[PDB]
Amino acid sequence: ATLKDITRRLKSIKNIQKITKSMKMVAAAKYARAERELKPARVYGVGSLALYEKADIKTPEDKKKHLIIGVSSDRGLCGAIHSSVAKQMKSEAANLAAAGKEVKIIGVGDKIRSILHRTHSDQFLVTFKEVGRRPPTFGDASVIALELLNSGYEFDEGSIIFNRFRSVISYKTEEKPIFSLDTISSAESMSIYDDIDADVLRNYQEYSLANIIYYSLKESTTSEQSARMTAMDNASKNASEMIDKLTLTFNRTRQAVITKELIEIISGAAAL
Amino acid sequence: DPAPATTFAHLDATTVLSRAIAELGIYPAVDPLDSTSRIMDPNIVGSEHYDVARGVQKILQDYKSLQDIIAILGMDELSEEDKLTVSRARKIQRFLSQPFQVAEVFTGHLGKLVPLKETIKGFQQILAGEYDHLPEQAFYMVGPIEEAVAKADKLAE
Amino acid sequence: AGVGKTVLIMELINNVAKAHGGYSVFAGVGERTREGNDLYHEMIESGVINLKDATSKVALVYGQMNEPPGARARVALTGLTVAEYFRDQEGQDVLLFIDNIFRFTQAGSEVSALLGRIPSAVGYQPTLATDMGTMQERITTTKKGSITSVQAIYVPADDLTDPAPATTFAHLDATTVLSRAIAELGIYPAVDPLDSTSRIMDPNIVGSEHYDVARGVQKILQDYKSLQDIIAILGMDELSEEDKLTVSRARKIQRFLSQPFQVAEVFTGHLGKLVPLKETIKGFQQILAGEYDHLPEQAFYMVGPIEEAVAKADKLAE
Amino acid sequence: DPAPATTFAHLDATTVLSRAIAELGIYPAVDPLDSTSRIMDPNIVGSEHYDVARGVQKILQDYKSLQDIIAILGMDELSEEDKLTVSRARKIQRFLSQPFQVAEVFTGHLGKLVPLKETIKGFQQILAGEYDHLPEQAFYMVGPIEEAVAKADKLAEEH
Amino acid sequence: QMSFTFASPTQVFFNSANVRQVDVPTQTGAFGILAAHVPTLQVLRPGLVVVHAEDGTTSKYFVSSGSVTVNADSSVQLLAEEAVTLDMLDLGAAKANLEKAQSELLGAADEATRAEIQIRIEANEALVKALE
Amino acid sequence: KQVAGTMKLELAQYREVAAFAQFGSDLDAATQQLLSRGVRLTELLKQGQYSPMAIEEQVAVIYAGVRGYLDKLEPSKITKFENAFLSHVISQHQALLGKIRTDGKISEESDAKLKEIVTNFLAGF
Amino acid sequence: VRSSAGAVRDAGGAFGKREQAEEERYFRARAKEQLAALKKHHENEIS
């Protein structure tokens, strides 16, 4: 195009490249912090899951209630994090609704709520915002657990979907099950645990719910920050690879403009 | 340039072949949004033909508008309707490519004449959404859409 | 400016006059009078020029910046004339510094415009190619001697395809890129080991051992450049043993490229060194093979041969 | 261009109308960050006028810088000292617009004259934060600041 | 043998460690866990867990709340919501908080507030009884 | 030379992490301190119409700013501090300014006296 | 060539339009909230 258009485009792309570069720096910082915080939380959450791991509780498959909890943040620009989590949530919801279960969904993070407010819009039970702005804490998990239990929904089963942080390059959309005291009581595998009435058992169930929520929050936060680091690195590299061609074109057009103006001047001079 | 710029006014139908498309391997490299005709009239080519052609151009133009963002923020930053539009636009860009008889020596592929009704039908189907399950490359260098379906079957094994 | 261009020029003059017996010419085309006087006095101070005992190693020719274009387009030929004498009628090697080579093409352009010739592509004279050729084609190695020209280059508008640099680069047989980012790090000369290139980095011309050492150093320095980002992002503690070893090797090689110049003694204070080719190849072979993984980085900063680095390593633990 | 470029040196005051601002509907389109003057000094127009003019220019320039970030991050991600900056800058952009008496054919509104004191006071207040509670569209094409307050009230009532 | 795992959300004290005996509080009643204790589930109460290594060494960590699981395969998991070593506390603050809570429990604003104040009371009470 | 030699480097370091200034948080204390020193140094270089400063006063102001006696101050107030500190030094400590002007150097005696002056003034601000 | 401030809006490309639309969205939302609060205050102030 004209020299002005190329100049203006090139300036804008330089701005975008700088912004994405600084963004990748910030995301790297928050990633280092989150991946440092995830070490204790990984063992904490694994310990919390240990029970249901090593005393299998196969739920009675003749229930009507379920609960699907998806974990992610409010912010975007992080690859396909929210996309994958919402895809898993809708896959599970549809598969379960094939059997007529009264499914319900809690969305942690506004992005999950939005991606599922077209289909599964009605099934929402409650959702939370201001996720990922600051690193999550056990207080946040306790808040989610409280707002779940108080909500008069007597769910008979549940799943929590999050993005387990494999490595700085890869994450896996994992799903962990969660049960209810009615399932634990009737689970014969609990016969070998003593001092188990329906008071300690379900207080322990409340705490286990909070534990799994916190573990998923930490895993997903680390995965989100790693994804944002990678995404902004890729965006900066794309912007630079575009600025290469735009600079070459700008120099060609600048020389063409100089030559054209000069030829006009000398053709006027010769003509007189 | 003054020469083509001047000759543009002496032609009924232009066909702007572009190097950008040819570098993608699509052939003929015709640029769908620079080619024009004076008989693109609903009273001349009918209404189904005109509507299919204009839908193709609308979707290609939308994808072109998206390309500026796509080239930096990737396709992971688009709405779902935008992702679907981009998928359809890429399918259409590929489906426009055809193997010519005179290019057998280049490509080896067999040259095809696609009757007009087959072309309209295929593009109507791609726009409707009857082929959102196939991959883009199933449309690359095929004649009528039957061959596209057959190639998509071949790729699945 | 500010990177060591004049000190590097003086060191090249000195070394070539000392290790080969060949004199040098300095054709300051389009030379600022202030900079010309400063260069003259720097040379007198540094000994390459001497006003008393007829043992100067430089012939200065100055086409100042306030002379009509007809005189700035010909001074390069005066320098070439003096150097051609030193090559033909005294059969030796010669250095020919041309600061600047852009001002040569610009002066030619103004002369052509004055005469009334249709300006070429970007305003440069129509005869740009052959104006550059007639000059650049007398800097060659005939059967009596050779003229080696070091041509300071200015790239207009940061445009490497501009007709001036485009015509110049068709003749350059090598490139040396002094960079500020390496004067800050304290390494001198600032020569950028990666931007600097050469035509004779070819196993046939320089040899297989020289070639392989050069490529080894380039590869390790590229790897360290790539790893610096990861160290700046994900932290140092998450690098393998091999990565940390390459970082150590790269830092040691970096420091080893620095050298003390006999003409910059008053700056560093260190006595100047002239490292012969084979000693440099040996030192870098050894550093790369790992023979010196057991020495500290600063043992390599501003030393001559490698054995001198070993001596420094000893003396810094006693 | 050579012609305007050469004229710039022959004026004691330039008000560079801009097409980009006129596209946002702000009329007059005067470009606040390109219009200059020779009497814009703390000695010739007074300390407070000068401080307010420079504050307007600085906040608009900060907003210009922020728009680059807002392009990528979205605007919900902005900090809370900058969302305030963006909101205030938009309010000031709108408040710089005014309806003229010769434009009644276009806008339909009634032309207004805003003596100097009203302008300085209104911009002082918009900068200080005394109008963070009114919508920005309350300032669009109004005269003194009190009229912006009245328009905000009328929008609220008709809401 | 016993595989211990004591881990606050913020920090982890033991990871699959091998201790001899661990004394833990609990809602039902404070009790000790040894290398073959029968499997149990419990939820902790504000108290102090006491660990003893394979040898005769000891360590006391004051835990606010949590859950202690003893599994079939002799694996103890003591997840505590806030586990702090005793050297991190100060008497006067806890004592004044306890006395304030006792003072306000007279003010039966509501049963929920009564319970909240009661929890704070015996929390600080365990604190002082550990530090007094 | 003594003062601007380090001011140049401080601004050079600030100019290569300037972009973060908006984000500001989410970054370590290293770049945070870099761009907290840079902002103060920048706001020292602001100046007004037709009011050039004598070399010794420029040296005093840049000394206060770069030696670190301003990093604990809100940037918006820096100018005021300057316009105050300057005047203060002009009034009371004219002898120190005379010594800097004549010696043309910040002797360690003058250096210590200037540090004392800056500390005392900054205390009562 | 260098980079200016606020060049994304100047370019007018897809990014400029996207930025302008995002800003208009956010401030439409905030204007709705402020109008609601202004009506509520005007009712709470007759008392």
Ligand SMILES: Nc1ncnc2c1ncn2[C@@H]1O[C@H](COP(=O)(O)OP(=O)(O)O)[C@@H](O)[C@H]1O
């Ligand atoms: N090998 C070196 N040892 C010490 N100082 C050096 C060396 N090379 C360059 N410098 C420093 O870098 C500065 C650059 O100045 P110089 O190269 O003489 O002029 P120019 O900047 O025009 O090339 C010098 O003042 C010198 O002190």
